[PDB]
Design a protein around this motif. Structure first.
Motif, short mmCIF file in Angstrom:
data_model
loop_
_atom_site.label_atom_id
_atom_site.label_comp_id
_atom_site.label_asym_id
_atom_site.label_seq_id
_atom_site.Cartn_x
_atom_site.Cartn_y
_atom_site.Cartn_z
N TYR A 1 -60.04 4.65 -25.32
CA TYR A 1 -59.86 3.22 -25.25
C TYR A 1 -59.51 2.87 -23.83
O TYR A 1 -59.02 3.71 -23.07
CB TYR A 1 -58.78 2.82 -26.22
CG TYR A 1 -59.14 3.32 -27.60
CD1 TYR A 1 -60.23 2.79 -28.30
CD2 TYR A 1 -58.44 4.37 -28.17
CE1 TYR A 1 -60.62 3.30 -29.53
CE2 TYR A 1 -58.82 4.89 -29.42
CZ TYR A 1 -59.91 4.35 -30.09
OH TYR A 1 -60.29 4.92 -31.29
N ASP B 1 -54.55 3.07 -21.46
CA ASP B 1 -53.39 3.69 -22.01
C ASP B 1 -52.04 3.15 -21.52
O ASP B 1 -51.02 3.32 -22.19
CB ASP B 1 -53.44 5.21 -21.78
CG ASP B 1 -54.23 5.96 -22.87
OD1 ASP B 1 -55.48 6.12 -22.75
OD2 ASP B 1 -53.57 6.40 -23.84
N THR C 1 -48.59 8.56 -31.58
CA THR C 1 -47.60 9.03 -32.51
C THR C 1 -47.52 10.56 -32.53
O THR C 1 -46.46 11.14 -32.74
CB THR C 1 -47.87 8.48 -33.90
OG1 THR C 1 -48.36 7.14 -33.77
CG2 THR C 1 -46.58 8.42 -34.73
N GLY D 1 -55.80 9.32 -20.09
CA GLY D 1 -55.23 9.02 -21.38
C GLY D 1 -53.72 8.94 -21.47
O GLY D 1 -53.07 8.39 -20.58
#
Ligand SMILES: CO[C@H]1O[C@H](CO[C@H]2O[C@H](CO)[C@@H](O)[C@H](O)[C@@H]2O)[C@@H](O)[C@H](O[C@H]2O[C@H](CO)[C@@H](O)[C@H](O)[C@@H]2O)[C@@H]1O
Ligand SMILES: CO[C@H]1O[C@H](CO[C@H]2O[C@H](CO)[C@@H](O)[C@H](O)[C@@H]2O)[C@@H](O)[C@H](O[C@H]2O[C@H](CO)[C@@H](O)[C@H](O)[C@@H]2O)[C@@H]1O
Ligand SMILES: CO[C@H]1O[C@H](CO[C@H]2O[C@H](CO)[C@@H](O)[C@H](O)[C@@H]2O)[C@@H](O)[C@H](O[C@H]2O[C@H](CO)[C@@H](O)[C@H](O)[C@@H]2O)[C@@H]1O
Ligand SMILES: CO[C@H]1O[C@H](CO[C@H]2O[C@H](CO)[C@@H](O)[C@H](O)[C@@H]2O)[C@@H](O)[C@H](O[C@H]2O[C@H](CO)[C@@H](O)[C@H](O)[C@@H]2O)[C@@H]1O
Ligand SMILES: [Ca+2]
Ligand SMILES: [Ca+2]
Ligand SMILES: [Ca+2]
Ligand SMILES: [Ca+2]
Ligand SMILES: [Mn+2]
Ligand SMILES: [Mn+2]
Ligand SMILES: [Mn+2]
Ligand SMILES: [Mn+2]
Lengths: 231, 231, 231, 231
Positions: free
Chosen positions: A100, A202, A15, A221
């Motif tokens: 992640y 990602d 975001t 990422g």
């Protein structure tokens, strides 16, 4: 730097750099901030399929991502690629992880391009240990089960974070040429995005770049191995 | 040196190195001395067409050369390319001149290969000034009227003697792989062989070589830009 | 009657009408007594694949039947189809059962034909309830699991004996024409032959016939739905 | 009556039934009154080329007509063919003349359709005396110089007025099916519209119809052999 046109399958919403609050598919024209996005209900562990298409008549770039027995996500963006990309380009697949992770396994990939009455077509229903017609960059590896793994996957089959890898088709592709009535291409790949953690990242992307494109430094990422920054 | 499998359109008979007494087409397997030849009634000044085909089922390499409204020449030779060529190869066109000359103009060229799937296909119905997916070697030039000239042609359109040039498709081609049931390829090109002198030389050839193949030194004339010697 | 050229996958040896002592694949030219056969290790219950090819250069009809992780059976026969078949034909799949039975399930089927340049190509990666481009004859049914069942199969999935069915592509195919340099075709289908009894029968076949071909009466069993008699 | 979706190349403007004041190309959806048109600078005596394309992702039907060394005309119209046409259709070319006339010679025609997979592809780089895979209707004839003449032409090569003819590909085409992610087709034909008079009429069209479509009575002239009236 490089000139990039890509269709991203963004599994992790950033975001802060303009991403919507949910996994989405988008159309990136020389920017990681999608010119157009669409919500995408990513299915962790399932094999998906993405179809991308562009034609000089409409000058519209479209993509459709789907999982069997599920609705598809579709995104389209009006763009004249003659004003964006150079005549000759290279086409490929890219993927990254960050904090992640997720597996970014490509199970197959095909592409067709026609400049009208010249044509190029390739199909990979499987990948070999040394796929000589693929230029692998970053953590990308082939032969890994007959699959193409864009990002790091450890022996046990687990994905590693902070990974980036790309795979470009070896030959340059004549994307456009003014004396042509109809220039067009389409691509298709099946993938397997699987992440053990609650929030996979990602994403995967099909891209068209300048022939000498390479992974920008630090583009792990959110930059999906495509862009040098979040501009 | 290089490993060469080619289909030659030999316009000039070199009876001294094993050529029959007339223009012929032949199948060369790691030797300029054709394993099998066939008489070819070459038509100076006319655009011809050559079709080459091979499939793992028959393991037979065939070629057919023809001009409109004329009979065609055909030559076939039984060969298991897995025992001749390496898994990955490059495919291209080659041509030379010697004392005698002729234009070795290629007006178009296409190729398709399938390893069963996995496929490669390209088509050049025209050639551009900078055909980035073609690796030109020797005197070969593109953009020369939208055509590919394998050997030297001067402004007035005349061919030069002692010339040699080749054009290879940029990407490596997976010619074979044991786990395949059916491996196969086919190629097609139209050409324009025109020579002002009574005896044109030396010919055109479609060839398949090791990926890093290059014109052997001195292979002008009878070596067709393929072989280092007449062995 | 009809003019038939077919590649048979004969699961049941009829030593009385010329069959070898084992399942085999063969090339039938206007006769159920194969012009050329080859032993075939049929795998009851497993999905097989058959590749058939013919080209006017070699004038050789070849076929290759295989199962994954197993050796393949191959049979080739020299034949000039211009002297056997009429210019326009229809192409299809056929199958039968007799005393002994087996399922003759076709899971997919494709065909490509070129008369050079005119071309025809179709692919069925699945079959629908009402496949309007297929002319079904006999016990042949579609939609039966997205599959094409050439012969009778009962609710429980069991094959019925004394069954015969065929499926022809709707459009006529221009198989040859004298003004052509290269006429050629190829076909591919995956099948599932499964029989509960110790001896499955009778087989599957790809065939090329006169456009108005239909199952000869009584051609169940050993006639594979192709021929009126065992001559 | 029939359900018609066509791309017309209207050489004669009928301002009375909604035509613009100039030759135009248009997109007809169950009406001869184009949903969208574009000006077309028709070149009497020259061979033109038309490319039509549709894909389920965009659901946009586009066409591009061009003459060598001249600008092209392009017309696109947003339409979901699943709500217009039935699942199975037939595709073809149509043409008419009225008070004014012109030759409606088709020199070649190709079509490709994919429902994903399942595919259909045909190419006519020439037409024979008895093109068995073409269903000719009206004044349409083949073999007429290896060309397909949609409307009447007399020995001297002159076109006759009040003529109507169509040519449909023999096999039905599965245009759509709900379980498909991407349904798409494209078609291409070259034509030769030549008229001795000052105001040629009436035009040529590529159309997709119900499988059992036939030329509506009296549909010569402005109805292009497609519609029963001007509604
Ligand atoms: C300190 O937070 C910042 O970094 C976090 C981690 O960033 C790296 O890891 C993520 C996921 O693996 C990857 O996408 C990035 O590119 C980096 O590789 C990141 O989680 C965090 O974002 C979160 O917070 C922001 C707002 O601060 C939101 O916009 C995001 O959607 C996340 O909620 C941020 O970038
Ligand atoms: C002295 O004659 C020898 O060389 C001649 C010229 O050779 C060069 O040019 C040819 C043709 O362009 C080229 O192929 C060569 O490799 C050289 O670059 C040559 O013409 C000649 O050949 C003829 O003579 C021999 C001997 O009779 C015959 O066997 C051949 O069929 C020719 O008739 C010879 O090599
Ligand atoms: C001895 O009986 C004869 O007919 C048997 C039944 O034939 C029918 O069923 C078979 C099998 O499905 C089919 O192929 C036929 O066309 C009929 O539909 C048949 O089983 C039998 O053949 C066997 O015996 C003869 C002689 O012993 C052998 O030549 C064969 O190889 C079989 O072993 C025979 O024709
Ligand atoms: C009596 O006039 C009406 O019919 C005229 C002739 O119509 C036939 O010929 C045309 C062209 O070949 C064909 O399209 C028709 O279907 C008939 O086959 C026609 O010329 C005339 O049209 C006039 O008015 C319109 C105004 O929209 C103009 O576009 C025309 O050019 C004429 O001015 C009328 O329909
Ligand atoms: Ca993101
Ligand atoms: Ca020679
Ligand atoms: Ca038998
Ligand atoms: Ca009109
Ligand atoms: Mn994004
Ligand atoms: Mn020779
Ligand atoms: Mn038999
Ligand atoms: Mn109109």
């Amino acid at each position: 730097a490089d000139t990039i046109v890509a269709v991203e399958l963004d599994t992790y919403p950033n975001t802060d750099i303009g991403d919507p609050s949910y996994p989405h598919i988008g159309i990136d024209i020389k920017s990681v901030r999608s010119k157009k996005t669409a919500k995408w209900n990513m299915q962790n562990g399932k094999v998906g399929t993405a179809h991308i298409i562009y034609n000089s008549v409409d000058k519209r770039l479209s993509a459709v991502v789907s999982y069997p027995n599920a609705d598809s996500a579709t995104v389209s963006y009006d763009v004249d690629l003659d004003n964006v990309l150079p005549e000759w380009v290279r086409v490929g697949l890219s993927a990254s992880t960050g904090l992640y992770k997720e597996t970014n396994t490509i199970l197959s990939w095909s592409f067709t391009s026609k400049l009208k009455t010249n044509a190029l077509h390739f199909m990979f229903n499987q990948f070999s240990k040394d796929q000589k017609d693929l230029i692998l960059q970053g953590d990308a590896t082939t032969g890994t089960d007959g699959n193409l793994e864009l990002t790091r996957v450890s022996s046990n089959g687990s994905p590693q974070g902070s990974s980036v890898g790309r795979a470009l088709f070896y030959a340059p592709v004549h994307i456009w040429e003014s004396s042509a009535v109809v220039a067009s291409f389409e691509a298709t790949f099946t993938f397997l995005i699987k992440s053990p953690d609650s929030h996979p990242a990602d994403g995967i992307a099909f891209f068209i770049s300048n022939i000498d494109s390479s992974i920008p430094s630090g583009s792990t990422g959110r930059l999906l191995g495509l862009f040098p920054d979040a501009n």
